[PDB]
Design an enzyme around this catalytic site. Structure first.
Site, PDB file in Angstrom:
ATOM      1  N   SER A  70      -0.604  -0.971  -6.279  1.00  0.00           N
ATOM      2  CA  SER A  70      -0.452  -2.157  -7.105  1.00  0.00           C
ATOM      3  C   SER A  70       0.090  -1.797  -8.484  1.00  0.00           C
ATOM      4  O   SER A  70       0.091  -0.637  -8.902  1.00  0.00           O
ATOM      5  CB  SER A  70      -1.785  -2.885  -7.246  1.00  0.00           C
ATOM      6  OG  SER A  70      -2.330  -3.181  -5.976  1.00  0.00           O
ATOM      7  N   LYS A  89     -15.226  -8.227  -7.363  1.00  0.00           N
ATOM      8  CA  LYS A  89     -14.324  -9.053  -8.161  1.00  0.00           C
ATOM      9  C   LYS A  89     -13.683 -10.143  -7.309  1.00  0.00           C
ATOM     10  O   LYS A  89     -13.604 -11.307  -7.722  1.00  0.00           O
ATOM     11  CB  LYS A  89     -13.252  -8.177  -8.805  1.00  0.00           C
ATOM     12  CG  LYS A  89     -12.214  -8.937  -9.608  1.00  0.00           C
ATOM     13  CD  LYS A  89     -12.580  -9.016 -11.074  1.00  0.00           C
ATOM     14  CE  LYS A  89     -11.749  -8.037 -11.887  1.00  0.00           C
ATOM     15  NZ  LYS A  89     -11.527  -8.498 -13.283  1.00  0.00           N
ATOM     16  N   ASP A  90     -13.241  -9.786  -6.106  1.00  0.00           N
ATOM     17  CA  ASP A  90     -12.646 -10.752  -5.194  1.00  0.00           C
ATOM     18  C   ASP A  90     -13.675 -11.748  -4.685  1.00  0.00           C
ATOM     19  O   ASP A  90     -13.341 -12.903  -4.419  1.00  0.00           O
ATOM     20  CB  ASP A  90     -12.001 -10.008  -4.037  1.00  0.00           C
ATOM     21  CG  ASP A  90     -10.693  -9.376  -4.419  1.00  0.00           C
ATOM     22  OD1 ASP A  90     -10.639  -8.637  -5.422  1.00  0.00           O
ATOM     23  OD2 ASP A  90      -9.723  -9.573  -3.679  1.00  0.00           O
ATOM     24  N   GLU A 113       4.824 -34.166  -0.680  1.00  0.00           N
ATOM     25  CA  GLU A 113       3.607 -33.641  -1.264  1.00  0.00           C
ATOM     26  C   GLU A 113       3.914 -33.018  -2.621  1.00  0.00           C
ATOM     27  O   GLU A 113       5.055 -32.665  -2.926  1.00  0.00           O
ATOM     28  CB  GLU A 113       2.965 -32.613  -0.337  1.00  0.00           C
ATOM     29  CG  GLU A 113       1.989 -33.201   0.669  1.00  0.00           C
ATOM     30  CD  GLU A 113       0.620 -33.484   0.074  1.00  0.00           C
ATOM     31  OE1 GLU A 113       0.546 -34.124  -0.994  1.00  0.00           O
ATOM     32  OE2 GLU A 113      -0.388 -33.063   0.679  1.00  0.00           O
ATOM     33  N   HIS A 120       0.809  -1.209   0.000  1.00  0.00           N
ATOM     34  CA  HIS A 120       0.000   0.000   0.000  1.00  0.00           C
ATOM     35  C   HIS A 120       0.844   1.262   0.000  1.00  0.00           C
ATOM     36  O   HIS A 120       0.373   2.301  -0.470  1.00  0.00           O
ATOM     37  CB  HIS A 120      -0.934   0.004   1.204  1.00  0.00           C
ATOM     38  CG  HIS A 120      -2.059  -0.972   1.089  1.00  0.00           C
ATOM     39  ND1 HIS A 120      -3.166  -0.932   1.907  1.00  0.00           N
ATOM     40  CD2 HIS A 120      -2.249  -2.012   0.245  1.00  0.00           C
ATOM     41  CE1 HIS A 120      -3.986  -1.913   1.577  1.00  0.00           C
ATOM     42  NE2 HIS A 120      -3.454  -2.583   0.572  1.00  0.00           N
TER      43      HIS A 120
HETATM   44  C1  HEM Z   1       1.106 -15.786   2.423  1.00  0.00           C
HETATM   45  C2  HEM Z   1       0.756 -15.696   1.147  1.00  0.00           C
HETATM   46  C3  HEM Z   1       0.572 -14.374   0.534  1.00  0.00           C
HETATM   47  C4  HEM Z   1      -0.423 -13.490   0.787  1.00  0.00           C
HETATM   48  C5  HEM Z   1      -1.562 -13.667   1.751  1.00  0.00           C
HETATM   49  C6  HEM Z   1      -0.189 -12.361  -0.025  1.00  0.00           C
HETATM   50  C7  HEM Z   1      -1.047 -11.267  -0.013  1.00  0.00           C
HETATM   51  C8  HEM Z   1      -0.996 -10.350  -1.032  1.00  0.00           C
HETATM   52  C9  HEM Z   1      -2.097  -9.625  -1.501  1.00  0.00           C
HETATM   53  C10 HEM Z   1      -3.491  -9.707  -0.959  1.00  0.00           C
HETATM   54  C11 HEM Z   1      -1.668  -8.841  -2.513  1.00  0.00           C
HETATM   55  C12 HEM Z   1      -2.507  -7.886  -3.311  1.00  0.00           C
HETATM   56  C13 HEM Z   1      -3.207  -8.663  -4.426  1.00  0.00           C
HETATM   57  C14 HEM Z   1      -2.224  -8.992  -5.515  1.00  0.00           C
HETATM   58  O1  HEM Z   1      -1.622  -8.066  -6.100  1.00  0.00           O
HETATM   59  O2  HEM Z   1      -2.008 -10.180  -5.838  1.00  0.00           O
HETATM   60  C15 HEM Z   1      -0.298  -9.086  -2.682  1.00  0.00           C
HETATM   61  C16 HEM Z   1       0.475  -8.465  -3.623  1.00  0.00           C
HETATM   62  C17 HEM Z   1       1.752  -8.916  -3.893  1.00  0.00           C
HETATM   63  N1  HEM Z   1       2.385  -9.978  -3.392  1.00  0.00           N
HETATM   64 FE1  HEM Z   1       1.682 -11.159  -2.135  1.00  0.00          FE
HETATM   65  N2  HEM Z   1       0.906 -12.543  -0.765  1.00  0.00           N
HETATM   66  C18 HEM Z   1       1.435 -13.741  -0.483  1.00  0.00           C
HETATM   67  C19 HEM Z   1       2.572 -14.359  -0.997  1.00  0.00           C
HETATM   68  C20 HEM Z   1       3.451 -13.708  -1.846  1.00  0.00           C
HETATM   69  C21 HEM Z   1       4.618 -14.252  -2.388  1.00  0.00           C
HETATM   70  C22 HEM Z   1       5.134 -15.644  -2.159  1.00  0.00           C
HETATM   71  C23 HEM Z   1       5.203 -13.280  -3.170  1.00  0.00           C
HETATM   72  C24 HEM Z   1       6.446 -13.402  -3.942  1.00  0.00           C
HETATM   73  C25 HEM Z   1       7.610 -13.565  -3.328  1.00  0.00           C
HETATM   74  C26 HEM Z   1       4.377 -12.133  -3.096  1.00  0.00           C
HETATM   75  C27 HEM Z   1       4.616 -10.953  -3.741  1.00  0.00           C
HETATM   76  C28 HEM Z   1       3.601 -10.025  -3.944  1.00  0.00           C
HETATM   77  C29 HEM Z   1       3.763  -8.915  -4.879  1.00  0.00           C
HETATM   78  C30 HEM Z   1       4.979  -8.610  -5.707  1.00  0.00           C
HETATM   79  C31 HEM Z   1       2.618  -8.224  -4.842  1.00  0.00           C
HETATM   80  C32 HEM Z   1       2.279  -6.995  -5.631  1.00  0.00           C
HETATM   81  C33 HEM Z   1       1.629  -7.458  -6.931  1.00  0.00           C
HETATM   82  C34 HEM Z   1       1.470  -6.288  -7.858  1.00  0.00           C
HETATM   83  O3  HEM Z   1       1.655  -5.128  -7.432  1.00  0.00           O
HETATM   84  O4  HEM Z   1       1.151  -6.477  -9.050  1.00  0.00           O
HETATM   85  N3  HEM Z   1       3.316 -12.431  -2.292  1.00  0.00           N
HETATM   86  N4  HEM Z   1       0.101 -10.030  -1.776  1.00  0.00           N
HETATM   87  C1  HEM Z   2      -0.722 -22.034   6.896  1.00  0.00           C
HETATM   88  C2  HEM Z   2      -1.843 -22.718   6.713  1.00  0.00           C
HETATM   89  C3  HEM Z   2      -1.843 -24.168   6.927  1.00  0.00           C
HETATM   90  C4  HEM Z   2      -1.434 -25.119   6.058  1.00  0.00           C
HETATM   91  C5  HEM Z   2      -0.885 -24.895   4.678  1.00  0.00           C
HETATM   92  C6  HEM Z   2      -1.615 -26.368   6.689  1.00  0.00           C
HETATM   93  C7  HEM Z   2      -1.278 -27.550   6.040  1.00  0.00           C
HETATM   94  C8  HEM Z   2      -1.541 -28.775   6.599  1.00  0.00           C
HETATM   95  C9  HEM Z   2      -1.322 -30.000   5.959  1.00  0.00           C
HETATM   96  C10 HEM Z   2      -0.768 -30.195   4.576  1.00  0.00           C
HETATM   97  C11 HEM Z   2      -1.699 -30.972   6.814  1.00  0.00           C
HETATM   98  C12 HEM Z   2      -1.650 -32.444   6.545  1.00  0.00           C
HETATM   99  C13 HEM Z   2      -2.976 -32.835   5.903  1.00  0.00           C
HETATM  100  C14 HEM Z   2      -3.031 -34.328   5.765  1.00  0.00           C
HETATM  101  O1  HEM Z   2      -3.126 -35.039   6.785  1.00  0.00           O
HETATM  102  O2  HEM Z   2      -2.978 -34.855   4.634  1.00  0.00           O
HETATM  103  C15 HEM Z   2      -2.163 -30.359   7.987  1.00  0.00           C
HETATM  104  C16 HEM Z   2      -2.629 -31.048   9.075  1.00  0.00           C
HETATM  105  C17 HEM Z   2      -3.013 -30.392  10.229  1.00  0.00           C
HETATM  106  N1  HEM Z   2      -3.049 -29.077  10.469  1.00  0.00           N
HETATM  107 FE1  HEM Z   2      -2.581 -27.744   9.260  1.00  0.00          FE
HETATM  108  N2  HEM Z   2      -2.122 -26.199   7.913  1.00  0.00           N
HETATM  109  C18 HEM Z   2      -2.293 -24.888   8.134  1.00  0.00           C
HETATM  110  C19 HEM Z   2      -2.786 -24.223   9.252  1.00  0.00           C
HETATM  111  C20 HEM Z   2      -3.121 -24.889  10.414  1.00  0.00           C
HETATM  112  C21 HEM Z   2      -3.449 -24.274  11.625  1.00  0.00           C
HETATM  113  C22 HEM Z   2      -3.513 -22.792  11.869  1.00  0.00           C
HETATM  114  C23 HEM Z   2      -3.706 -25.281  12.532  1.00  0.00           C
HETATM  115  C24 HEM Z   2      -4.090 -25.130  13.940  1.00  0.00           C
HETATM  116  C25 HEM Z   2      -5.153 -24.418  14.279  1.00  0.00           C
HETATM  117  C26 HEM Z   2      -3.522 -26.511  11.860  1.00  0.00           C
HETATM  118  C27 HEM Z   2      -3.687 -27.737  12.437  1.00  0.00           C
HETATM  119  C28 HEM Z   2      -3.477 -28.911  11.725  1.00  0.00           C
HETATM  120  C29 HEM Z   2      -3.736 -30.210  12.338  1.00  0.00           C
HETATM  121  C30 HEM Z   2      -4.229 -30.460  13.735  1.00  0.00           C
HETATM  122  C31 HEM Z   2      -3.448 -31.128  11.413  1.00  0.00           C
HETATM  123  C32 HEM Z   2      -3.550 -32.614  11.579  1.00  0.00           C
HETATM  124  C33 HEM Z   2      -4.894 -33.098  11.053  1.00  0.00           C
HETATM  125  C34 HEM Z   2      -4.676 -33.724   9.707  1.00  0.00           C
HETATM  126  O3  HEM Z   2      -3.516 -33.924   9.299  1.00  0.00           O
HETATM  127  O4  HEM Z   2      -5.647 -34.052   8.999  1.00  0.00           O
HETATM  128  N3  HEM Z   2      -3.159 -26.241  10.575  1.00  0.00           N
HETATM  129  N4  HEM Z   2      -2.049 -29.008   7.842  1.00  0.00           N
END
Ligand code: HEM
Ligand code: HEM
Ligand SMILES: CCCCCCCCCCCCCCCCCC(=O)OC[C@H](COP(=O)([O-])OCC(O)COP(=O)([O-])OC[C@@H](COC(=O)CCCCCCCCCCCCCCCCC)OC(=O)CCCCCCCCCCCCCCCCC)OC(=O)CCCCCCCCCCCCCCCCC
Ligand SMILES: CCCCCCCCCCCCCCCCCC(=O)OC[C@H](COP(=O)([O-])OCC[N+](C)(C)C)OC(=O)CCCCCCCCCCCCCCCCC
Ligand SMILES: CCCCCCCCCCCCCCCCCC(=O)OC[C@H](COP(=O)([O-])OCC[N+](C)(C)C)OC(=O)CCCCCCCCCCCCCCCCC
Ligand SMILES: CCCCCCCCCCCCCCCCCC(=O)OC[C@H](COP(=O)(O)OCCN)OC(=O)CCCCCCCCCCCCCCCCC
Ligand SMILES: CCCCCCCCCCCCCCCCCC(=O)OC[C@H](COP(=O)(O)OCCN)OC(=O)CCCCCCCCCCCCCCCCC
Lengths: 31, 379, 98, 445, 52, 56
Positions: free
Chosen positions: B205, B227-228, B271, B201
């Site tokens: 963007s 849109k979102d 995975e 911000h």
């Molecule tokens: C945790 C996951 C992420 C969240 C929640 C997140 C959140 C956001 C959101 C909501 C926006 C505005 C919408 C958009 O332009 O796409 C944004 C913009 C952006 N994000 Fe992320 N983001 C994530 C991961 C990443 C990653 C992995 C990268 C790359 C390293 C990245 C780089 C950017 C960039 C460069 C922008 C600006 C896009 C533009 O101005 O055209 N973000 N992010």
């Molecule tokens: C960042 C976002 C998250 C991702 C990407 C994520 C990803 C995963 C994945 C890949 C598994 C294994 C699924 C499987 O069994 O095949 C898993 C299991 C689990 N996650 Fe998360 N997780 C997230 C957030 C959370 C949070 C915030 C909690 C706690 C509140 C949580 C609690 C668990 C628990 C208890 C399991 C075991 C149950 C299961 O495997 O089915 N996760 N998660």
């Protein structure tokens, strides 16, 4: 500066035409 | 007398965030994934909670508790498979987001790009621990294989493994440790996402054309909120199709077997959203070199803003760079396919070629193409 | 010859379809931003309108009809002198700081 | 004729000394004018709290009347030959100089002898002069730079004679009778602590014989026994804030202990000061001045005017800066100004040191242009250094200054030294003294 | 980038900051040895090695 | 005064200040551990396992 005395006020009159001057590293001046 | 929308502190922050924030007019659909990430995150924070409410963390009750959630908890299977496949949805959105940032030259926003790289690392670590949690065969053996990489680190490396393992092998200690870490990490991800939105911000963007759009700016609320909403509806369509119709499509069946340290599954694959990097790991016989390439495969995004040599910012008007970018995407897909297959002819040589080509495209081909590119346009 | 390749590239670039000129597509770094500020008013107004029309077209995912495409020969070079001067001044500053 | 050739061709500063002690010093040239003045070592430093303001009063009454010239007659003699008579009294020196033609030298020296010696000090004129000083005190109150510098001196040398203002508190000036002034004259206007200077179309032999035939009556004794000694003055790093939000602009002066008139470290520090430079809103250099602080101030329109000073007394000085800026800039300059000083304390490039050397050479050679500045230089140097420093010696001392010397001397005087901040006006944004003292040291170094 | 930072006065600044940077690195090395309790190095310092 | 020499030597530079702090960390840690352990063993002499292991 505020002037409220004859001695301090002396010289603050003008007897020569106004002449401005500005510089590059010197502050602006006038006379 | 004033809007409490733009005078109340919290409401002022919300207003400047996503109500009256000036957004580019021509933002394409590829930007929706931003919110599609956050929504996924929220969903992942939500369902995981309701999973941690019926999930123990002991090796004598991990798999049994997961089966309990699937079979006995009222509608628990919906939450379980919603989490398992929302992880894949999260990573699909993440990869498409990184691709968007790469293509349209959004990495010029240095702070946001670096914060994004940090978020990518955190999300990958969290997903790894989560997949370790259900204590299947895939879980246990992938955890052992992945953590054993840290033994390659010189000097401290071995100790580090024994530190993370909490002992001598992935065992009772590591399961609970990974549970705690998988719980805590997503909130750190949320904090970093808030910081990311702040940094973005501060500049605004970037539109697909790559040019500053300060003249054609529209309010966020009446347009991009709906849109979102449409983007979220589409992502929910895909995710719900996945969960309801084919839940065990992106998983591995061997994960439905109690973890037995005395026997390994026929294949040890991670995975899907990790295979692209795992193949790179398998490319170099030198184990330390393998770990270094594994880290560099993600850390390259940090260097990406530096390598930008084209006078233009985006790839809208760079056909040569467009073919290069699609070569890169095909290369990543090739690495993902290679990761699944065993270490045999001809997958070994194809994997080495793909891994070489990935870094060759990112580091050499793209900057040289941009250099030729500027010359082709009088600048 | 080479100029044929350059013309082919200008056609395949796509910014002509949007009515944009070459210099409108340049990335706005600090040097480019200062150069744009330095532009005369009449050039700046046309630059802003061309950019806004292009953003409109890309929002609706359309292009101008073939007749209103900036031809390769008609692609003037307005930002080039100002950008060159700005780069020269920056180079002088860096050399003096050396 | 290169620079060096011109320097060793500047006339000398022939110095003599009569039996009573009055040092005669002249500097011949070819101009038909001249500038002859007497530089006494009086000043606010040599004044106790009871009689502070005596020197200003004596300077006021000097030209009023004499025993030989009853009054306005003296002004008539001065004006008839076109001479401009002036006098400036500071915290250390007090001087009278007549600017007149070379032919009027015998008369001008006589006029100066009458003032410094046979001063009337009539009680009626004392009463008339009492109000004038009081009005001048309010005028100085309107002069915000002067009140800021007086605040600097008061808060830096607190509890010492230097903290006393030159004019004196507007309570002593209302009780200073004839008796107090007469002791000041008979105790400070003595021949040994006097320099008869002249420059222009002046002949050193002529100045010597005029002094012998006029100032011979000057006494060198100190009455019964009272010899006002030199009291060393302590520098107490402190701060004072006279916040007056009505004032349009805010003045802040911050200075650390600098050396005395001795201690050649002045020459490096001045170069360092020249590196910081000086700026005013009407300069025209803009965001191109070599001085980093000046360029930043011009770029962001931070201040209206900042000037670096090296006020120097016999044993201690106030070396630092004084800037005038609006309410929402005071902190910012405190960041940059300090940030500038430490740069010279940690990394001073040879290029900027060469630039500072050139600026200092220009300042010295330009300041000595004209008979009156030359006479002032002679009178001041004979009291401070005991001899007029030839410009060639200045050139040599400047040449010996390089980057390492500037870094060493700045780290010796600037680094981690408690400052003497003094602020006036809407100085709310002025950083707290703890913040300033913290800014006096860098955590990188 | 590197074209701008390669200068006479730039190397001169590097030389000025060499002592502070080098003994900052020494600070870091000693702190690392201390916090980590690096026995390989601490076995040679006279008094401290008595701890092991 | 010695304190002036300490300030001019080890305290003026911030980085030298940090180095002094770091070496003081080593030596203070060792000395304090020795002192506190000795005080405790003195207070409870004859009760700790260290004082009774010899007879087994
Ligand atoms: C945790 C996951 C992420 C969240 C929640 C997140 C959140 C956001 C959101 C909501 C926006 C505005 C919408 C958009 O332009 O796409 C944004 C913009 C952006 N994000 Fe992320 N983001 C994530 C991961 C990443 C990653 C992995 C990268 C790359 C390293 C990245 C780089 C950017 C960039 C460069 C922008 C600006 C896009 C533009 O101005 O055209 N973000 N992010
Ligand atoms: C960042 C976002 C998250 C991702 C990407 C994520 C990803 C995963 C994945 C890949 C598994 C294994 C699924 C499987 O069994 O095949 C898993 C299991 C689990 N996650 Fe998360 N997780 C997230 C957030 C959370 C949070 C915030 C909690 C706690 C509140 C949580 C609690 C668990 C628990 C208890 C399991 C075991 C149950 C299961 O495997 O089915 N996760 N998660
Ligand atoms: C024709 C048959 C093939 C159509 C799809 C492939 C193609 O060439 O698309 C070109 C084009 C999309 O790319 P583009 O308009 O050339 O460039 C602008 C961006 O794509 C951004 O344009 P947008 O913001 O309008 O988004 C359009 C995009 C929407 O894409 C997404 O929402 C993300 C992808 C997952 C869905 O639709 C797509 O089909 C592209 C992604 C899937 C390609 C397969 O889509 C179409 O012409 C029709 C799309 C709708 C389906 C019919
Ligand atoms: C690199 C920093 C020092 C690492 C290290 O092992 O230090 C020795 C100390 C103590 O080990 P040590 O000195 O008994 O043996 C060092 C060599 N290894 C580790 C291979 C046995 O290390 C630690 O206390 C933790 C090391 C990992 C964290 C850094
Ligand atoms: C959390 C819960 C508990 C919180 C309270 C207990 C823990 C903190 C108590 C002490 C806090 C204040 C002192 C901390 C040190 C400090 O920076 O003091 C301020 C002081 C303020 O500066 P100073 O003026 O004292 O010293 C610097 C100035 N010279 C160089 C002239 C002496 O900070 C420093 O001194 C800066 C250097 C600090 C170096 C710290 C790391 C050294 C070891 C590295 C390995
Ligand atoms: C989540 C982010 C979006 C929502 C928060 C930001 C938008 C403002 C919310 C409050 C609002 O719109 O109205 C509150 C309303 C009083 O509004 P009013 O004073 O009539 O007009 C000034 C602006 N509120 O307060 C009232 O009590 C009006 C009636 C409310 C419903 C009953
Ligand atoms: C999706 C498949 C369709 C597709 O991409 O079609 C090309 C189209 C062109 O978009 P446009 O902005 O018009 O490009 C300039 C045209 N002159 O659309 C695009 O170029 C948009 C697709 C590229 C930019 C968004 C990122 C997509 C990343 C997909 C792979 C992700 C994993 C690899 C990268 C990390």
């Amino acid at each position: 500066r505020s002037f409220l005395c004859r001695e301090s006020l002396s010289g603050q009159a003008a007897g020569r035409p106004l002449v401005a001057s500005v510089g590059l590293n010197v502050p602006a001046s006038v006379r | 007398m004033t809007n409490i929308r733009k005078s109340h502190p919290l409401m002022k922050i919300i207003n400047n965030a996503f109500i009256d924030l000036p957004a580019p007019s021509n933002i394409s659909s590829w930007w929706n994934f931003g919110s599609l990430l956050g929504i996924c995150l929220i969903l992942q924070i939500l369902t995981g909670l309701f999973l941690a409410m019926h999930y123990t963390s002991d090796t004598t009750t991990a798999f049994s508790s997961v089966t309990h959630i699937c079979r006995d908890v009222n509608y628990g299977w919906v939450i379980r498979y919603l989490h398992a496949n929302g992880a894949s949805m999260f990573f699909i959105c993440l990869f498409i987001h990184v691709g968007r940032g790469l293509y349209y030259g959004s990495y010029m926003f240095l702070e946001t790009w670096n914060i994004g790289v940090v978020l990518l690392f955190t999300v990958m670590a969290t997903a790894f621990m989560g997949y370790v949690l259900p204590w299947g065969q895939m879980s246990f053996w992938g955890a052992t294989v992945i953590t054993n990489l840290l033994s390659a680190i010189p000097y401290i490396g071995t100790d580090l493994v024994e530190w993370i393992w909490g002992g001598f092998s992935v065992d009772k200690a590591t399961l609970t440790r990974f549970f705690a870490f998988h719980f805590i990490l997503p909130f750190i991800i949320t904090a970093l996402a808030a910081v990311h939105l702040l940094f973005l911000h501060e500049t605004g963007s970037n539109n697909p054309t790559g040019i500053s759009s300060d003249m054609d700016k529209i309010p966020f609320h009446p347009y991009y909120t709906i849109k979102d909403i449409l983007g979220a509806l589409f992502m929910m369509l895909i995710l719900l199709i996945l969960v309801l119709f084919s839940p065990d499509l992106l998983g591995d069946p061997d994960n439905y077997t109690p973890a037995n340290p005395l026997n390994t599954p026929p294949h040890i694959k991670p995975e899907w959203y990790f295979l692209f990097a795992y193949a790179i790991l398998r490319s170099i016989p030198n184990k330390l070199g393998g770990v270094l390439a594994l880290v560099a495969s993600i850390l390259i995004l940090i260097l990406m803003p530096m390598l930008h040599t084209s006078k233009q910012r985006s790839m809208m008007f760079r056909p040569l760079s467009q073919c290069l970018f699609w070569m890169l995407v095909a290369d990543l897909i090739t690495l993902t396919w290679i990761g699944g297959q065993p270490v045999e002819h001809p997958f070994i040589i194809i994997g080495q070629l793909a891994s070489i080509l990935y870094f060759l495209i990112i580091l050499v081909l793209m900057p040289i193409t941009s250099i030729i590119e500027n010359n082709l346009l009088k600048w | 010859w080479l100029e044929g390749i350059r013309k082919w590239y200008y056609n395949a670039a796509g910014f002509n379809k949007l009515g944009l000129m070459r210099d409108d597509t340049i990335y706005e770094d600090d040097d480019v931003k200062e150069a744009i500020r330095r532009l005369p008013e009449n050039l700046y107004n046309d630059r802003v309108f061309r950019i806004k029309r292009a953003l409109d077209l890309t929002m609706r995912q359309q292009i101008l009809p073939k007749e209103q495409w900036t031809k390769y020969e008609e692609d003037k070079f307005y930002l080039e002198p100002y950008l060159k001067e700005v780069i020269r001044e920056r180079k002088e500053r860096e050399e003096w700081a050396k | 004729a290169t620079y060096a050739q011109a320097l060793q061709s500047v006339p000398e500063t022939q110095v003599s000394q009569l039996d009573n002690g009055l040092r005669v010093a002249s500097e011949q040239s070819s101009q038909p004018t001249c500038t002859v003045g007497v530089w006494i070592d009086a000043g606010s430093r040599y004044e106790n709290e009871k009689n502070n303001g005596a020197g200003y009063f004596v300077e006021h009454l000097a030209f009023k009347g004499t025993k030989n010239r009853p009054g306005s007659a003296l002004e008539k003699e001065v004006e008839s030959m076109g001479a401009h008579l002036n006098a400036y009294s500071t915290r250390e020196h007090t001087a009278y100089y007549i600017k007149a033609l070379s032919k009027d030298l015998p008369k001008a020296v006589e006029l100066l002898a009458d003032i410094v010696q046979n001063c009337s000090l009539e009680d009626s004129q004392i009463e008339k002069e009492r109000d004038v000083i009081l009005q001048e005190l309010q005028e100085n109150d309107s002069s915000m730079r002067d009140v800021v510098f007086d605040y600097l001196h008061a808060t830096a040398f607190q509890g010492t004679p230097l903290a006393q203002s030159v004019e004196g508190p507007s309570e002593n000036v209302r009780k200073l009778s004839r008796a107090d002034l007469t002791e000041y004259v008979s105790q400070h206007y003595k021949a040994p602590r006097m320099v008869l200077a002249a420059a222009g179309g002046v002949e050193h032999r002529q100045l010597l014989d005029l002094a012998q035939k006029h100032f011979s009556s000057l006494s060198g004794t100190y009455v019964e026994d009272a010899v006002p000694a030199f009291t060393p003055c302590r520098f107490t790093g402190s701060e004072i804030r006279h916040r007056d939000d009505a004032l349009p602009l805010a003045h802040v002066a911050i200075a650390v202990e600098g050396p005395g008139w001795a201690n050649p470290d002045n020459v490096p520090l001045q170069v360092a000061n020249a590196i910081i430079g000086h700026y005013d809103s009407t300069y025209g250099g803009g965001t191109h001045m070599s001085s980093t602080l000046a360029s930043v101030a011009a770029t962001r329109k931070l201040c209206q005017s900042f000037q670096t000073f090296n006020i120097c007394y016999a044993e201690t000085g106030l070396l630092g800066a004084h800037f005038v800026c609006d309410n929402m800039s005071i902190d910012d300059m405190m960041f940059f100004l300090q940030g500038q000083w430490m740069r010279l304390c940690t990394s001073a490039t040879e290029s900027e040191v060469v630039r500072g050397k050139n600026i200092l050479r220009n300042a010295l050679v330009s300041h000595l242009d004209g008979t009156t500045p030359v006479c002032e230089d002679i009178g001041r140097s004979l009291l401070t250094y005991g001899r007029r420093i030839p410009l060639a010696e200045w050139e040599s001392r400047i040449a010996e200054v390089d980057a390492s010397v500037v870094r060493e001397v700045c780290s010796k005087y600037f680094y981690d030294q408690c400052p003497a901040v003094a602020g006036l006006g809407p100085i709310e944004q002025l950083p707290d003294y703890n913040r300033i003292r913290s800014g006096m040291f860098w955590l990188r170094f | 980038m590197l074209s701008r930072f390669l200068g006479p006065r730039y190397r001169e600044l590097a030389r000025n900051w060499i002592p502070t940077a080098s003994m900052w690195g020494a600070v870091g090395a000693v702190g690392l040895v201390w916090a980590t309790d690096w026995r390989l190095i601490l076995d040679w310092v006279p008094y401290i090695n008595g701890k092991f | 005064t010695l304190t002036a020499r300490l300030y001019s030597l080890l305290f003026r530079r911030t980085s030298t200040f940090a180095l002094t702090i770091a070496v003081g960390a080593l030596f203070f840690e060792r000395a304090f551990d020795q002192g506190a352990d000795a005080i405790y063993e003195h207070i409870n002499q004859g009760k700790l396992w260290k004082h009774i292991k010899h007879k087994y």
